[PDB]
């Protein structure tokens, strides 16, 4: 077939990024490393840092929507009781 | 030829050749780059250029003398050459440069000009000579944090912080009679050399060099130096191999000759009996490769180096080459073993029976320093002729099959994949 429209990604040898000069990388084999030394000092010390950074953006919305749900229940509980029969008659019509 | 060693306090070795028109005399020390630390890396390279400096060489050229020197990982050399009937002057010149008067050479003016000359050699090496500096980085990651990792020329960062006192300290600890061999090659008789030394009462320094704490240890690792402005990719790859004084010394050398060396632009090199060339030549994956088996006092390396311009098919070149290595354990033919026997003998004959007495002086001194004597070339041929197909499979299953690797590269190496995709190709497991 023919070539198609060009993209923002290529393949191995020509990936389309900028040219690199002056960066050096080092590594070691897995067979030469001690087994999994990365589970602990990571499930307590690091996992707590990740929790403390982001828990405020979830729990303030959750607190708003859960408080709104309970006040709706308790009011519906009350309207269909014997004490809340007179208020049920008004807010319907 | 026939060698002859003695010990009158000084170890004297000789290899006479009545056909030569020259004679070489020198001294070889049993310390090199592997007997240094990262702070003084390059101090042996400065002693080379102080010996070859202009005011020292001028004194030699007035009597008909030429100088040479060579720095390697396990030894160092200082040779003087002359006509056959002038070898008595060669020893006197060597007397007033090492045994006496190596302070006139370390003057202030001679040390600053020499230093500036060495800083410019190592700078042009790191920016223009890509095949050799990638092979230096291979030794530096494979043997990291051990003495066998340090480069033989030094680095630009450690060279700048070297003063005269660093040169004098290194000489007091290593240029010793216990660590030295006096050699002679070409047209020189063994008895004429020893009687000339006895008539002078020479003694460099007594002995007991330092201890060298750590041993060499191979580590599987990689180092990548990416540069997208250069036009090729240069790669080297090796496993742990054999040291000298190993029983498998010649079996490792023979297994490298099975895959050999290649040049794409020479017509006869495309016709070699190497099965790997049927895969490479279809799409022209490389320009050249060469297989090596290097050997030192404590460890070794076995592998290959390559250079290519097909920067999109690098993974197919590395893949096809490692699938042939597997055949040494599984399926290697008797024909492949007999070809490699014949060419290895030709390779060793050219190295040891060249014409240059300077090359023969370096080989002799290094061998006598490390095993006490020199093996003949007629005895080495008999060992090579006694290697079987079963011996290659036993060696490969120990050293190659499912073993860690060391890698280094520079240039356009974006297409060189991760370590574990390459580590996995060392065992077939379709088997």
DSSP conformation letters of B356-390: -HHHHHHHHHHHHHHHSS---HHHHHHHHTT--HH
Q: How many CB atoms lie within 10 A of CB B229?
A: 9
Whole-angstrom distance, CA of residue B409 vs CA of residue B151: 17
Residue A79 to residues A68, A83, A86, A90, B419: CA-CA distances in angstroms?
17, 8, 8, 11, 70
Fold annotation for B1-202: Cytochrome Bc1 Complex; Chain A, domain 1 (3.30.830)
- B220 contact residues in A (CB cutoff 8 A): 28-29, 31-32
C-alpha span between B149 and B141 (Å, rounded): 7
Q: Which residue, among B308, B305, B385, has the nearest Cα to B341 in the 3D structure?
A: B385
List b or e across B136-161, with b for residues whose CB sees 16 or more CB atoms inside 10 angstroms: bbbbbbbbbebbbbbbbbbeeebbee
Q: In angstroms, what CA-CA distances link B350 with B3, B137, B187, B344, B374?
A: 18, 29, 19, 10, 17
DSSP code at position B96 = I
Contacts 24+ apart (CB under 8 A), B258-267: B258/B328, B258/B332, B258/B336, B258/B337, B258/B339, B258/B340, B259/B291, B259/B304, B259/B321, B259/B324, B260/B290, B260/B291, B260/B343, B261/B288, B261/B289, B261/B290, B261/B291, B262/B286, B262/B288, B262/B289, B262/B290, B263/B287, B263/B288, B264/B288
The answer to whether the beta carbons of residues B198 and B36 sit under 8 Å apart is: no
Q: Say what the resolution is, in angstroms.
A: 2.5
Element (H, E) at B94: helix B87-94
Those residues with Cβ within 8 angstroms of residue B423's Cβ, 6 or more apart along the chain or in another chain: A29, B220, B404, B405
Q: Which helix (H) or strand (E) segment is B256 a member of?
A: helix B249-256
Name the pairing type of β-strands B288-295 and B300-308: antiparallel
B412 → chain A, closest CA residue: A13
CA dist., res. B394 & res. B387, Å (int): 12
Chain B residues 5-64 with a CB less than 8 Å from chain A: none
Q: Where are the domains of chain B?
A: 1-202, 208-431
User: Least CB-CB distance to B226: which of A23, A30, A31?
Assistant: A23
- Rounded to the nearest angstrom, the minimum Cα separation between A11 and chain B is 8
CATH code of the region A1-93:
1.20.5.210
- B1-202 matches B208-431 in fold: yes
Question: Is A13 close to B415, i.e. CB distance below 8 A?
Answer: yes
Q: Torsions phi, psi of A32, nearest 5?
A: -95, 0
Contact residues on chain B for A15, CB-CB shorter than 8 A: 414
Q: Looking at chain A, which residue has its C-alpha nearest residue B411? A: A21
HSE-up of B60 (CA within 13 Å, CB side)? 24
Single out the residue of B32, B36, B38 nearest to residue B74, CA to CA: B32
d(CA B134, CA B150): 13
Q: Which of A12, A23, A27 sits opposite B419 (nearest CB)?
A: A27
Beta strands B221-227 and B406-411, pairing class: parallel
A29 touches chain B (CB under 8 A): yes
Is the Cβ–Cβ distance between B279 and B259 less than 8 Å? no
Using what technique was this structure determined? cryo-EM
Q: In what order do the strands lie in the sheet with B23-29?
A: B3-7, B11-16, B180-186, B23-29, B76-82, B66-71
Interchain proximity B414–A26, CB inside 8 Å: no
Angle among Cα B79, B80, B82 to the nearest 5 degrees reads 145
Domain with residues B208-431, CATH architecture:
2-Layer Sandwich (3.30)
The whole-angstrom distance between B409's CA and the closest CA on chain A is 10
* Cβ <8 Å between B404 and A20: no
User: Rounded to the nearest 5 degrees, what angle is found at the Cα of B140, between the Cα atoms of B134 and B145?
Assistant: 170
Comparing CA positions, the residue from B34, B44, B30 lying closest to residue B162 is B44
């Amino acid at each position: 077939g023919p070539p198609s429209g060009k993209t923002y990604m290529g393949w191995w040898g020509h990936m389309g990024g900028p040219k690199q000069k002056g960066i050096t990388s080092y590594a070691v084999s897995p067979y030469a490393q001690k087994p999994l030394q990365g589970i602990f000092h990571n499930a307590v010390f690091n996992s707590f840092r990740r929790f403390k950074s982001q828990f405020l953006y979830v729990l303030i919305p959750a607190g708003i929507y859960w408080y709104w749900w309970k006040n709706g229940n308790e009011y519906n509980e009350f309207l269909y009781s014997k004490a809340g029969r007179e208020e049920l008659e008004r807010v319907n019509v | 030829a026939e060698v002859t060693q003695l010990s009158n306090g000084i170890v004297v070795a000789t290899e006479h050749n009545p056909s030569a028109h020259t004679a070489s005399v020198g001294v070889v020390f049993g310390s090199g780059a592997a007997n240094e630390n990262p702070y003084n890396n390059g101090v042996s390279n400065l002693w080379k250029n102080i010996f070859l400096s202009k005011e020292n060489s001028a004194v030699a050229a007035k009597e008909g003398l030429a100088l040479s020197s060579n720095i390697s990982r396990d030894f160092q050399s200082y040779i003087v050459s002359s006509l056959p009937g002038s070898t008595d002057k060669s020893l006197d010149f060597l007397n007033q440069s090492f045994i006496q008067q190596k302070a006139n050479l370390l003057s202030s003016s001679n040390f600053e000009a020499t230093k500036k000359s060495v800083l410019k050699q190592v700078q042009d090496f790191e920016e223009n000579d890509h095949p050799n500096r990638v092979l230096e980085h291979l030794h530096s990651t494979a043997f990291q944090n051990t003495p066998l990792s340090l480069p033989t020329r030094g680095t630009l960062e450690s060279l700048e912080n070297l003063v005269v006192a660093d040169l004098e300290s290194f000489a007091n600890n290593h240029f010793l009679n216990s660590n030295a061999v006096v050699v002679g090659t070409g047209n020189i008789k063994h008895e004429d050399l020893v009687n000339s030394i006895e008539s002078k009462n020479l003694s460099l320094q007594t002995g007991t060099k330092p201890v060298l704490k750590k041993k060499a240890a191979f580590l599987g690792s990689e180092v990548r130096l990416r540069d997208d402005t250069l036009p090729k990719a240069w790669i080297s790859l090796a496993v742990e191999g054999e040291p000298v004084n190993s029983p498998n010394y010649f079996v490792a050398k023979l297994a490298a000759q099975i895959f050999g060396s290649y040049n794409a632009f020479e017509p006869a090199s495309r016709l070699q009996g190497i099965k790997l060339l049927d895969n490479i030549q279809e799409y022209q994956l490389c320009d050249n490769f060469n297989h090596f088996s290097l050997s030192y006092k404590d460890s070794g390396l076995w592998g290959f180096s390559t250079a290519t311009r097909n920067v999109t098919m690098i993974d197919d070149l590395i893949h096809f080459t490692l699938k042939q290595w597997n055949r040494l354990t599984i399926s290697v033919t008797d024909t492949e073993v007999e070809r490699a026997k014949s060419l290895l003998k030709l390779q060793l004959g050219q190295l040891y029976e060249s014409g240059n007495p300077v090359n023969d002086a370096n080989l002799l001194g290094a061998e006598v320093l490390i095993k006490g004597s020199k093996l003949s070339l007629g005895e080495a041929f008999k060992k090579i002729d006694a290697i079987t197909v079963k011996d290659v499979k036993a060696w490969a299953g120990k050293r190659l099959w499912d073993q860690d690797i060391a890698i280094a590269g520079t240039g356009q190496i974006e297409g060189l994949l991760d370590y574990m995709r390459i580590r996995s190709d060392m065992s077939m497991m379709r088997w």
